[PDB]
């Protein structure tokens, strides 16, 4: 996260770290959506241009964390993966369209003060909140700068959703309805973005109607990090919710 701040304890209790077993390293962010299901970006698991194609036994999830590198004894919980599900129309060849994946845990995780699921939006909450200018929150343990370094604890940044024409005009990549973009414009002064290692983490909004947190996006892609005139692009969770529900219902 570029130009963010240290998270408060328990501020993002749905935060998940995707952790490679060997070598032991951070792979991505993710989010807890129930006691058995974790949501992430497909490119965290499958990205052939970078020779990335993980199987379940390559990975662990670490839930309840705050420190990036510490083993947070009596606080974090580490879970093994039963199965990965990647969207069948995930487009890793062109533009990361449908950049979404689910991971089912081998065993349910116990909720605590530090471990708790985020809601997924329904159609009405998405329509109400996914509007240009409305701010969401991105969290992660990724890089603090595009070029460097890395944070001691989970980082947080609040960013406004951007008008679709501005998103389109900021890039040569073909944008789709399964993406939205967020970030400040050069003229707005404030800044901030996700960066490498924040992939797969959540873009959340707090509904002013029922005071619950909803995951509206998944950290997906950006040209650099926090560059003037660029924006971060996020998987549109509601647009892909029918797939989410089909997977969870079936498996």
């Amino acid at each position: 996260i570029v130009e963010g701040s240290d998270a408060e304890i328990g501020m993002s209790p749905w935060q998940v770290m995707l952790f490679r077993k060997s070598p032991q390293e951070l792979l991505c962010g993710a989010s807890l959506i129930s006691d058995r299901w974790v949501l992430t970006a497909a490119h965290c698991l499958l990205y052939p241009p970078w020779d990335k194609n993980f199987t379940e036994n390559d990975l662990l999830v670490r839930i309840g964390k705050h420190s990036r590198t510490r083993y947070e004894r009596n606080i974090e919980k580490i879970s093994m993966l039963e199965k990965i599900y990647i969207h069948p129309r995930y487009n890793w060849r062109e533009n990361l369209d449908r950049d979404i994946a689910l991971m089912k845990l081998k065993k349910p995780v116990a909720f605590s003060d530090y471990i708790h699921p985020v809601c997924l939006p329904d159609r009405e909450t998405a329509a109400s909140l996914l509007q240009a200018g409305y701010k969401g929150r991105v969290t992660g343990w990724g890089n603090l700068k595009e070029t460097w370094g890395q944070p001691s604890v989970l980082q947080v940044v609040n960013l406004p959703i951007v008008e679709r024409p501005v998103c389109k005009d900021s890039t040569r990549i073909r944008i789709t309805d399964n993406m939205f973009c967020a970030g400040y414009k050069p003229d707005e002064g404030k800044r901030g973005d996700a960066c490498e290692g924040d992939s797969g983490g959540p873009f959340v909004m707090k509904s002013p109607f029922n005071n619950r947190w909803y995951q509206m996006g998944i950290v997906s892609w950006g040209e650099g990090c926090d560059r003037d005139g660029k924006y971060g692009f996020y998987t549109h969770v509601f647009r892909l919710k029918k797939w989410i529900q089909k997977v969870i219902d079936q498996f």
Partner: peptide
Amino acid sequence: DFEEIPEEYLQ
């Protein structure tokens, strides 16, 4: 860089 995690999670 990362603190070792209990071996039970790697088995």
